[PDB]
């Protein structure tokens with residue numbers, strides 16, 4: 289027996305069922321592109337179960353006793369085991385709708401709704417978007433300008449270099465302020481699509497006005513290609529950095545998030561992911577414990593109270609869950 293909720297079981301970075309999970313995740317992604325959110329979650333959950341298994345699935349008999357494995361996900365796995373390929377998955381892969389929605393949604397600042405609108409309007413390629421600049425936000429224009437670099441996996445070596453410049457800028461702007469790497473890299477991932485940093489200071493309020501200072505410093509070093517600062521709920525800067533490399537440079541997406549230290553454990557938990565892990569953790573919190581969890585806090589709607597947490601461990605404990613380090617949150 290394996291627990292139902294992804295937040296009740298360790299999911300490591302590397303596993304034994306990558307072919308099967310990849311296929312189910314194609315179907316999940318395609319469902320999301322069609323606005324079929326239930327079906328997305330269902331396929332995502334099934335793929336997550338395979339990631340938590342200790343052995344490869346070689347025969348269909350191994351599916352027995354697993355949660356979140358309905359008829360459809362089972363058929364997909366069955367066809368892959370018996371025939372090496374799943375016709376439904378291959379049809380999705382080859383479909384113009386899926387290919388175009390994947391193309392568009394990958395671009396910085398483009399979500400499903402925008403990509404679907406563009407599809408419906410007859411846009412198909414990146415050049416089509418460039419021919420219609422009035423249809424694009426500034427953020428999307430920047431994503432198109434740098435699209436090749438932004439669809440090149442970000443590497444741990446890139447992350448280490450970026451963390452150094454961000455730490456230097458933060459330290460120079462405000463001694464005592466800290467930078468914490470979050471997102472998939474904190475979970476042990478070797479690559480990613482962006483780099484996520486959470487900034488705070490141990491004295492509540494000393495973080496005020498820090499981010500614009502940090503950004504000024506980075507911009508003056510030539511390290512910023514694009515920056516969008518927003519006060520709202522955490523203060524954040526959505527950026528594209530110009531990462532110098534030997535004889536070259538590459539654009540890399542970086543999100544900088546400032547949280548007041550009182551909210552830091554909630555922010556770190558939220559921003560560390562995985563996306564499915566946090567969805568599951570919030571569902572667990574609400575359904576099993578009656579508490580509402582988000583990136584700012586843990587609220588009891590009956591008592592109208594907020595839980596004081598010093599750490600992620602505090603939050604897990606309060607929810608009655610065994611602690612999972614970030615590298616076991618790869619749901």
Ligand SMILES: Nc1ncnc2c1ncn2[C@H]1C[C@H](O)[C@@H](COP(=O)(O)OP(=O)(O)OP(=O)(O)O)O1
Nearest residue numbers: 471472479480481482484558559560561562563566
């Ligand atoms: N839709 C969402 N639901 C819940 N949490 C989310 C969602 N989107 C983002 N988050 C949280 C969890 C993520 O780990 C974190 C950073 O997002 P993001 O950088 O897109 O993912 P990631 O860093 O884990 O993977 P990647 O390797 O693609 O960067 O923010």
Ligand SMILES: [Mg+2]
Nearest residue numbers: 471472482484
């Ligand atoms: Mg990330």
